[PDB]
Write an enzyme that holds these catalytic residues in place. Structure first.
Site, short mmCIF file in Angstrom:
data_model
loop_
_atom_site.label_atom_id
_atom_site.label_comp_id
_atom_site.label_asym_id
_atom_site.label_seq_id
_atom_site.Cartn_x
_atom_site.Cartn_y
_atom_site.Cartn_z
N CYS A 62 -22.55 -6.85 -3.33
CA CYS A 62 -21.29 -7.84 -3.42
C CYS A 62 -20.21 -6.80 -3.16
O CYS A 62 -19.31 -7.42 -2.30
CB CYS A 62 -21.38 -8.60 -4.52
SG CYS A 62 -22.84 -9.69 -4.87
N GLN A 63 -20.12 -5.82 -3.77
CA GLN A 63 -18.74 -5.06 -3.71
C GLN A 63 -19.00 -4.02 -2.51
O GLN A 63 -17.93 -4.16 -1.64
CB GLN A 63 -18.78 -3.95 -4.81
CG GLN A 63 -17.44 -3.22 -4.91
CD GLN A 63 -16.25 -3.77 -4.87
OE1 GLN A 63 -15.78 -4.81 -5.45
NE2 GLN A 63 -15.70 -3.17 -3.93
#
EC number: 1.11.1.24
Lengths: 174, 169
Positions: A62-63
């Site tokens: 996600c990052q």
């Protein structure tokens, strides 16, 4: 839920709310803030919106790949007519606010909000075990133009910024 | 469920999930969670285990963790060897919360009480979050354990409460 699945041509569901801490121009992570309700159904009834769900704030895929791709292309998204970008997850509003600040977002270019209890994600069938799925929804004046979910771990083929920009380009108003 | 008491042994088989600090404060770089054997860690030395309802929440951030950080030297002067902050947030969130507070080493560790397993086993969890509480251990024996039930208060679990009980030892 009854809204599941969301498909192009559907209206965005009614009564959709998220919890979030509004940005302030400051990136200070130690200022926690105070959550308010975001009425997504009202917001999305006008203009072009991009709604992205991620399984978890601060988690690797996600990052490192997903949110950073959208950040890098915010000029292209704006030039393509996007009025708002929304990133949601099951993490609470405080964690989501920290995640946006950790990524250098101090303003409304991307809002970071909580899908409390995965209410919305479960309603459209894209949640599991307390977390949202990884998906992207494009809306224009209340109408779903695109809604797709990545079921392959680590992939952003369907919910990444390139998929969203491709959808926007196929609308024929560039 | 009766609470943990001074004089009890610290429970066996307590484990948390955490990302070992690397010295980096970059919140966009994450590591790999591993298990932390808390019962073993607490079997020797003086340890302070602090549970908070949530990483990055106002009382936990602005009052609770900052107090322990500010008075770390006082805690060490009292013989404290370990400070552990736990919550129900996953290890990635807890790691970022430690970095947000400038902690580069193991002086204060930030770990996940996965599914509130430990906090539930001692009666101090609710609805997927741990309570706000502190446990002081010396050589595997509890010397202090108390929970804050008043919203916004760190009367029972704050650093001043911990320093006071250590000063009476």
């Amino acid at each position: 839920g009854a809204m599941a699945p969301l498909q192009p041509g559907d209206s965005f569901p009614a009564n959709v709310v998220f919890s979030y801490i509004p940005p302030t121009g400051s990136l200070d992570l130690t200022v926690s803030g105070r959550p308010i309700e975001y009425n997504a159904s009202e917001a999305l009834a006008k203009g072009t919106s991009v709604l992205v769900a991620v399984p978890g704030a601060f988690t690797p895929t996600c990052q490192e790949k997903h949110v950073t791709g959208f950040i890098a292309k915010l000029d292209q998204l704006r030039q393509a007519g996007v009025d708002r970008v929304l990133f949601i997850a099951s993490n609470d509003a405080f964690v989501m606010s920290a995640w946006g600040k950790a990524n250098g977002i101090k303003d409304e270019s991307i809002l970071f909000l909580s899908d409390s209890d995965t209410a919305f994600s479960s309603s459209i069938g894209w949640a599991n075990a307390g977390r949202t799925g990884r998906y992207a929804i494009v809306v224009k004046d209340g109408k779903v133009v695109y809604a797709a979910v990545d079921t392959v771990r680590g992939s952003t083929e369907k919910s990444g910024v390139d998929a969203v920009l491709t959808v926007l380009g196929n609308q024929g108003k560039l």
